[PDB]
Chains A and B, each alone.
Chain A
Amino acid sequence: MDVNPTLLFLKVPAQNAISTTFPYTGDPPYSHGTGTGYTMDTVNRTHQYSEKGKWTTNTETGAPQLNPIDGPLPEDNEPSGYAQTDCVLEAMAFLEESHPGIFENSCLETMEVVQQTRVDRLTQGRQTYDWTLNRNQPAATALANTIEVFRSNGLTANESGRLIDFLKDVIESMDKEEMEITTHFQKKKQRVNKRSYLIRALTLNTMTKDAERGKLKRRAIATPGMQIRGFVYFVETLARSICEKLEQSGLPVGGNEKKAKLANVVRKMMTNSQDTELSFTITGDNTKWNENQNPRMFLAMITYITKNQPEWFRNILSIAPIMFSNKMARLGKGYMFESKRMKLRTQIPAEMLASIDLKYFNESTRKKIEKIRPLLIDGTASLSPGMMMGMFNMLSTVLGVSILNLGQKKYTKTTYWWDGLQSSDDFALIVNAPNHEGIQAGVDRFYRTCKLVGINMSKKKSYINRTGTFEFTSFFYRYGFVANFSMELPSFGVSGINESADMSIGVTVIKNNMINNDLGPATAQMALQLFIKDYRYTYRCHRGDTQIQTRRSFELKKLWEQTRSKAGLLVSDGGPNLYNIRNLHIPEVCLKWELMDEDYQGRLCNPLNPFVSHKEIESVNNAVVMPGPAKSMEYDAVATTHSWIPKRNRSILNTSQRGILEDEQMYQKCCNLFEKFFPSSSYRRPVGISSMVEAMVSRARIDARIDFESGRIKKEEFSEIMKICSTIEELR
């Protein structure tokens, strides 16, 4: 009786058993080396998708340009890049007609937050590409380096302390001709002219997608320069402001909101009286989305959205797509040859890849190289149309929801009226009609006006089905939503933060899955026990009665040998776990306080221990767990001696950039001293214009004189402090 688990679906619906189709208890694939072939593949794909566009140039730079503007319209089912100007204009003029005041409300609100915002906020965010060091640097580092290299040469506005003037200065940057750059060779100096400067500031680098499941081949992801994240933040606030308040949008969105939103969008149409009109839903995914959207379209869209505002705002916002149109993408890393079957191995220059034939490397990659040749100008390719994944997230959804909106009974001028939801990667298109030909015609007009705007349904993935059971964004709906405890198995486990910062996240995740996604109580007990065991193994904290041998055996043996009631002993000190569902919402120390020994508490809770490290308040009882992109998770647990911080990577040392580490030591020492004066600098980035020691010496004089008026201190300290102030001032 050879078994087959797929025979299960002859009794249980394929949407009440979907959970048993995810191979998500395994490991995801990764990328074993360079990703430059992907880069030229995608670049060639764009330049061929927009072929009968126009070939053009630049007078300032030289990187070849290509216009995918309307030109010849399509002629068969083939992804193309000839969206229409008049289409994108009317498509949102109509949207405005649908709900008045959206665009002007957005203009007002974003105007306000734009004049209010500051440069320091940039400090948070993902990694970035530094144009002075030619490399992927974290956020604050690139920030500091660009400000510094700005001050080095002749600029005078950045000292404003704001943000908008920082962006202005970025703007002014592109008018000089002789920019000076500092290098960290173990600190030489180099000079870059106007051309190679403009070239240098527009380069977003490429990398290989990693650890993402649901696909066979790998992908490529691009990261943009910190020169332009500023303009990005303005256009992002604008678009998000437009789309926070659209029933058919899901970009400024949350979680269960999505489910309730589509639930009420199903109700009406599902409610459509069963009188004379049948209806289907099409589950549709858009293929090659960001390879047909363009900069000119976004720019004309902006020229329409912010009509009738101050010119300050309109210019500021329209600079982003212009800078976005003339962009260049780095080729990549190179290729690690064998060069023979004997012991030879090397690495070639990603530049000589443009200087070598590469006939040695497979003739398919030879085709890649030959086609990509005319697009390289300096270590980078000219990607005039298209855009690489991960740069915008909003405006595309606004176009999608607009062409959705085109389909009401108001302007289609016939019986067919289509609508639905659009969520960045999916469209659920519910069509309503009395006639089968009605549904045919509706789908045709939809796909037609879509190809008019450069969003092309994927016929290979999209399917029609009577309403009642459909799925989108891996949410599966069968006359209502159901639960799949499969996409949340990755998060189940020792989060990898600390000890106490994890004994809480585990139970917190079990909490959320027991409240929202249908994880019954038996399974709650189950995952609780599994988490306990995995924790105890990864942290070597087994029970006190256990004679399992580890590096932390004898100490914990001590701790156990002298305690009147060990039920007070913490989990990661050798204590019995007493969590349940009743106890599942209270961190552990708060739960077992009543049962501790006093001296224990004094040794475990005392703030005189050196293994606690508190940073800025933006990071306290928080953690960024691994998931979509990474979101910030919060937890709660009594701060104790277990909240350590594991080490860092000692790898800059055997390199030519170790001096950055010493610069960091010096900065940090300069900063801790300041912190010694105003503890309030944990709840406020203090604003001021000084030399950062004026604050110190000033408050020094003040506080001394104060304490001496009431408190008990002798005056020799008064005099000595005053002459040490004379000291600190006698030099410069």
Chain B
Amino acid sequence: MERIKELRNLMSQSRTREILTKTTVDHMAIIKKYTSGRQEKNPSLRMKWMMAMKYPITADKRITEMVPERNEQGQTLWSKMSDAGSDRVMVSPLAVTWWNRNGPVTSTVHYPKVYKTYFDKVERLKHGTFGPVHFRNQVKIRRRVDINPGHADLSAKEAQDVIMEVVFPNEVGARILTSESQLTITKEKKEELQDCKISPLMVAYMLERELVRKTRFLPVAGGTSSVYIEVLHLTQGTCWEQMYTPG
């Protein structure tokens, strides 16, 4: 287990020793984001300024052993320049495009299940229903309405505990499940998420998005079905209605 050896390596130094020995767990939060830089309070300007330079984006180190320093033509694809405030590597956009034809291939057919919420939408839209167009004044009322096409109707924290139990099972504390429906869901879910190489926080986030209920003050005209609230673009507009029902 190379990790503990890495820990010793970091421990033998004086500075890291003094830091770790005197960093209580709570302080960790602070230390996660101590920074001398600020936020880009003109996102478009600096982006226009970056896309003309040579080494604008940042990547990890596994590049060198995974992507060549030279190109097939000779265009630099990464540089020895270490980044400020970090230990990453400067990279030009050109690398990405190569990776898109000479790159490591893996299996992503168990991919669409992580992102259930999204693919649901397209498989719906494929099976839509056509109907005529009508022009007339349209009564509008600004009221609160929900937008998720079905969920567990469970609380925010009620799903937070669920997710912490399923994905990071060794770390869910003394809290226990109570409901049978949610029990069955967590069961089938612990079943589904096995043998899938995928980002941890990403999958947990997709599930958090697929569970909790969300409402918004929106100007509705007529029915408040969430599958309908999805397609307010082509259902009704400023002075017209179009006939179509969600799949």
- Give Cα A256–Cα B97 distance, bound, in whole angstroms: 43
In the complex, which residues 112-171 of chain B have their Cβ closer than 8 Å to any Cβ of chain A? 112, 115, 118-119, 121-122, 125, 142, 160, 163-164, 167-168, 171
> Once the chains bind, are A732 and B21 in contact (CB under 8 Å)?
yes
Who on chain B is nearest to A140 by CB?
B33
Residues of chain A lying within 8 A (CB to CB) of residue B199: 607, 612, 614, 639
> Once the chains bind, are B58 and A724 in contact (CB under 8 Å)?
no
> Once the chains bind, are B86 and A665 in contact (CB under 8 Å)?
yes
> Once the chains bind, are A608 and B85 in contact (CB under 8 Å)?
no
Residues of chain B lying within 8 A (CB to CB) of residue A159: 24
Q: Pick the contact of A691: B21, B83, B96, B103 (CB < 8 A).
A: B21
Q: Pick the contact of B85: A493, A581, A583, A661 (CB < 8 A).
A: A661
> Once the chains bind, are A692 and B23 in contact (CB under 8 Å)?
yes
B22 CB to nearest A CB, Å: 7
> Once the chains bind, are A724 and B47 in contact (CB under 8 Å)?
no
Contact digits for A689-708, partner B, Cβ 8 Å, 1 yes 0 no: 11111011100100010000
Contact digits for B1-34, partner A, Cβ 8 Å, 1 yes 0 no: 1011111101110011101111111111111111
Residues of chain B lying within 8 A (CB to CB) of residue A666: 15-16, 19
- The answer to whether A591 has its CB under 8 Å from any CB of chain B is yes
Residues of chain B lying within 8 A (CB to CB) of residue A413: none
- The answer to whether B237 has its CB under 8 Å from any CB of chain A is yes
Who on chain A is nearest to B56 by CB?
A646
Q: Pick the contact of B26: A521, A612, A688 (CB < 8 A).
A: A688
Who on chain B is nearest to A598 by CB?
B105
B99, B101, B232: residue with the most chain A Cβ atoms closer than 10 Å: B101
Residues of chain B lying within 8 A (CB to CB) of residue A687: 25-26
Residues of chain B lying within 8 A (CB to CB) of residue A732: 17, 21
> Once the chains bind, are B10 and A558 in contact (CB under 8 Å)?
no
Assuming the contacts A586-B125, A603-B105, A649-B37, asked whether A256 and B217 have C-beta atoms less than 8 A apart, the reply is yes
- The answer to whether A120 has its CB under 8 Å from any CB of chain B is yes
Residues of chain B lying within 8 A (CB to CB) of residue A641: 96, 99-100
> Once the chains bind, are B121 and A639 in contact (CB under 8 Å)?
no
Who on chain A is nearest to B53 by CB?
A647
Q: Pick the contact of A683: B37, B73, B201 (CB < 8 A).
A: B201
In the complex, which residues 626-680 of chain A have their Cβ closer than 8 Å to any Cβ of chain B? 626, 630, 636, 638-639, 641-642, 644-650, 652-653, 657, 660-661, 663-671, 673-674, 676, 678-680
> Once the chains bind, are B115 and A648 in contact (CB under 8 Å)?
no
Who on chain A is nearest to B244 by CB?
A582
Q: Pick the contact of B107: A497, A552, A602, A630 (CB < 8 A).
A: A602
B94 CB to nearest A CB, Å: 6
- The answer to whether A323 has its CB under 8 Å from any CB of chain B is no
Assuming the contacts A603-B103, A625-B43, asked whether A693 and B56 have C-beta atoms less than 8 A apart, the reply is no
- Give Cα A652–Cα B197 distance, bound, in whole angstroms: 39
- Give Cα A497–Cα B40 distance, bound, in whole angstroms: 10
Assuming the contacts A642-B96, A680-B171, asked whether A581 and B105 have C-beta atoms less than 8 A apart, the reply is no
Who on chain B is nearest to A700 by CB?
B4
- The answer to whether A520 has its CB under 8 Å from any CB of chain B is yes
> Once the chains bind, are A587 and B118 in contact (CB under 8 Å)?
yes
In the complex, which residues 90-130 of chain A have their Cβ closer than 8 Å to any Cβ of chain B? 120, 123, 127
- The answer to whether B198 has its CB under 8 Å from any CB of chain A is yes
Residues of chain B lying within 8 A (CB to CB) of residue A685: 28-29
Residues of chain A lying within 8 A (CB to CB) of residue B57: 611, 644-647
Who on chain B is nearest to A563 by CB?
B101
In the complex, which residues 129-168 of chain A have their Cβ closer than 8 Å to any Cβ of chain B? 137-138, 140-141, 143-144, 147, 159, 161
- Give Cα A641–Cα B42 distance, bound, in whole angstroms: 24
- The answer to whether B174 has its CB under 8 Å from any CB of chain A is no
Residues of chain A lying within 8 A (CB to CB) of residue B167: 680
> Once the chains bind, are B46 and A496 in contact (CB under 8 Å)?
yes
> Once the chains bind, are A728 and B11 in contact (CB under 8 Å)?
yes
A237 CB to nearest B CB, Å: 20
> Once the chains bind, are A693 and B11 in contact (CB under 8 Å)?
yes
Who on chain A is nearest to B90 by CB?
A647
- Give Cα A256–Cα B57 distance, bound, in whole angstroms: 39
- Give Cα A680–Cα B142 distance, bound, in whole angstroms: 40
Who on chain A is nearest to B231 by CB?
A585
In the complex, which residues 587-617 of chain A have their Cβ closer than 8 Å to any Cβ of chain B? 587, 590-591, 593, 599-614, 616-617
- The answer to whether A353 has its CB under 8 Å from any CB of chain B is no
A137 CB to nearest B CB, Å: 8
> Once the chains bind, are B34 and A667 in contact (CB under 8 Å)?
yes
> Once the chains bind, are A552 and B93 in contact (CB under 8 Å)?
yes
Residues of chain B lying within 8 A (CB to CB) of residue A256: 142, 217-219
> Once the chains bind, are B168 and A679 in contact (CB under 8 Å)?
yes
> Once the chains bind, are B33 and A123 in contact (CB under 8 Å)?
yes
- The answer to whether A494 has its CB under 8 Å from any CB of chain B is yes
- The answer to whether B175 has its CB under 8 Å from any CB of chain A is no
Q: Pick the contact of B32: A255, A616, A680 (CB < 8 A).
A: A616
A382 CB to nearest B CB, Å: 30
A138 CB to nearest B CB, Å: 5
A559, A667, A686: residue with the most chain B Cβ atoms closer than 10 Å: A667
> Once the chains bind, are B22 and A691 in contact (CB under 8 Å)?
yes
- The answer to whether A620 has its CB under 8 Å from any CB of chain B is yes
Residues of chain A lying within 8 A (CB to CB) of residue B12: 731
> Once the chains bind, are A724 and B5 in contact (CB under 8 Å)?
yes
Residues of chain A lying within 8 A (CB to CB) of residue B192: none
Assuming the contacts A140-B33, A497-B43, A552-B93, asked whether A590 and B122 have C-beta atoms less than 8 A apart, the reply is yes
- The answer to whether B60 has its CB under 8 Å from any CB of chain A is yes
Residues of chain B lying within 8 A (CB to CB) of residue A682: 200-201, 204
> Once the chains bind, are B40 and A670 in contact (CB under 8 Å)?
no
- The answer to whether B228 has its CB under 8 Å from any CB of chain A is no
Residues of chain B lying within 8 A (CB to CB) of residue A144: 30-31, 34
- The answer to whether B194 has its CB under 8 Å from any CB of chain A is no
Who on chain B is nearest to A608 by CB?
B104
- Give Cα A682–Cα B85 distance, bound, in whole angstroms: 22
- The answer to whether A518 has its CB under 8 Å from any CB of chain B is yes
Who on chain B is nearest to A574 by CB?
B97
> Once the chains bind, are B7 and A603 in contact (CB under 8 Å)?
no
A671 CB to nearest B CB, Å: 6
Residues of chain A lying within 8 A (CB to CB) of residue B233: 511, 514-515, 524, 581-582, 584-585
B171 CB to nearest A CB, Å: 4
> Once the chains bind, are A610 and B63 in contact (CB under 8 Å)?
yes
> Once the chains bind, are A727 and B8 in contact (CB under 8 Å)?
yes
Who on chain B is nearest to A647 by CB?
B58
- The answer to whether B183 has its CB under 8 Å from any CB of chain A is no
Who on chain A is nearest to B117 by CB?
A636
B71 CB to nearest A CB, Å: 8
- The answer to whether A260 has its CB under 8 Å from any CB of chain B is yes
Residues of chain B lying within 8 A (CB to CB) of residue A257: 142, 217
- The answer to whether A276 has its CB under 8 Å from any CB of chain B is no
- Give Cα A686–Cα B27 distance, bound, in whole angstroms: 10
A711 CB to nearest B CB, Å: 13
> Once the chains bind, are A516 and B219 in contact (CB under 8 Å)?
yes
Residues of chain A lying within 8 A (CB to CB) of residue B84: 647-650, 652-653, 661
Residues of chain A lying within 8 A (CB to CB) of residue B38: 127, 138
- Give Cα A688–Cα B27 distance, bound, in whole angstroms: 10
> Once the chains bind, are B197 and A607 in contact (CB under 8 Å)?
yes
Assuming the contacts A610-B62, A647-B57, asked whether A679 and B200 have C-beta atoms less than 8 A apart, the reply is yes
23 chain-A/chain-B pairs, Cβ below 8 angstroms:
A123-B29, A127-B38, A256-B218, A496-B42, A520-B237, A538-B51, A540-B93, A552-B94, A585-B230, A586-B122, A602-B106, A603-B99, A603-B104, A606-B104, A644-B59, A646-B46, A652-B84, A661-B36, A669-B16, A674-B28, A676-B3, A682-B201, A725-B4
Chain B residues in the interface with A (C-beta under 8 A): 1, 3-8, 10-12, 15-17, 19-48, 50-51, 55-63, 66, 71-73, 75, 83-87, 90-101, 103-108, 111-112, 115, 118-119, 121-122, 125, 142, 160, 163-164, 167-168, 171, 197-202, 204-205, 217-219, 230-234, 237-238
- Supply 9 further A-B pairs (C-beta < 8 A) apart from A620-B205, A679-B168: A143-B30, A254-B217, A496-B43, A554-B75, A591-B122, A604-B100, A608-B104, A648-B83, A657-B36
The 9 closest A-B pairs by CB, nearest first: A496-B43, A688-B25, A602-B105, A603-B103, A555-B97, A680-B168, A610-B60, A496-B47, A496-B44
